[PDB]
Design an enzyme around this catalytic site. Structure first.
Site, PDB file in Angstrom:
ATOM      1  N   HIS A  37       0.846  -1.174   0.000  1.00  0.00           N
ATOM      2  CA  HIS A  37       0.000   0.000   0.000  1.00  0.00           C
ATOM      3  C   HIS A  37       0.882   1.223   0.000  1.00  0.00           C
ATOM      4  CE1 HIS A  37      -3.493  -2.401   1.248  1.00  0.00           C
ATOM      5  NE2 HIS A  37      -2.870  -2.791   2.356  1.00  0.00           N
ATOM      6  N   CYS A  84      -4.702   5.017  -1.886  1.00  0.00           N
ATOM      7  CA  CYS A  84      -3.615   4.072  -2.074  1.00  0.00           C
ATOM      8  C   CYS A  84      -3.475   3.826  -3.592  1.00  0.00           C
ATOM      9  CB  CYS A  84      -3.909   2.806  -1.359  1.00  0.00           C
ATOM     10  SG  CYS A  84      -2.784   1.482  -1.778  1.00  0.00           S
ATOM     11  N   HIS A  87      -4.409   0.394  -5.125  1.00  0.00           N
ATOM     12  CA  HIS A  87      -5.775  -0.019  -4.838  1.00  0.00           C
ATOM     13  C   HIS A  87      -6.811   1.059  -5.018  1.00  0.00           C
ATOM     14  CE1 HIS A  87      -3.439  -3.092  -2.321  1.00  0.00           C
ATOM     15  NE2 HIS A  87      -3.846  -3.679  -3.428  1.00  0.00           N
ATOM     16  N   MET A  92      -9.821   1.939  -2.367  1.00  0.00           N
ATOM     17  CA  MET A  92      -8.998   2.257  -1.182  1.00  0.00           C
ATOM     18  C   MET A  92      -8.670   3.755  -1.153  1.00  0.00           C
ATOM     19  SD  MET A  92      -5.831   0.163   0.446  1.00  0.00           S
ATOM     20  CE  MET A  92      -5.220   0.631   2.053  1.00  0.00           C
TER      21      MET A  92
HETATM   22 CU    CU Z   1      -3.509  -0.363  -0.924  1.00  0.00          CU
END
Ligand code: CU
Ligand code: CL
Length: 99
Positions: A37, A84, A87, A92
């Site tokens: 991440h 992120c 993601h 995210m």
């Molecule tokens: Cu992530």
């Protein structure tokens, strides 16, 4: 305050995803699951005067290890939207209110 990155249930989520801190109060984003991440602030969604490049991880840098975190201190009052990179398209994303 501490924010966990990724849920044990597999969610690609910041936990919590919408929260508040006082001006000058640190946020520490720590890997929990689902990593790699990172934490990037959307330059179109932060208060005037804030340099997104100073408060964001580099889009290319990743927290790839279980015990890694990313700490940031915000001062300018208002809302900050962040995400992120790997993601972002899975939802995210987060929001912090600095009060
Ligand atoms: Cu992530
Ligand atoms: Cl700044």
């Amino acid at each position: 305050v501490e924010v966990l990155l990724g849920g044990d249930d597999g969610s690609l989520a910041f936990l919590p995803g919408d929260f508040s801190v006082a001006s000058g109060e640190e946020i520490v984003f720590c890997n929990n699951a689902g990593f790699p991440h990172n934490v990037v602030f959307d330059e179109d969604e932060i208060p005037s005067g804030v340099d997104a490049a100073k408060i964001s991880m580099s889009e290319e840098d990743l927290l790839n290890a279980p015990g890694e975190c990313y700490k940031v201190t915000l001062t300018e009052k208002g809302t900050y939207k962040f995400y992120c990179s790997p993601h972002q398209g899975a939802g995210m994303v987060g929001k912090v209110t600095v009060n």
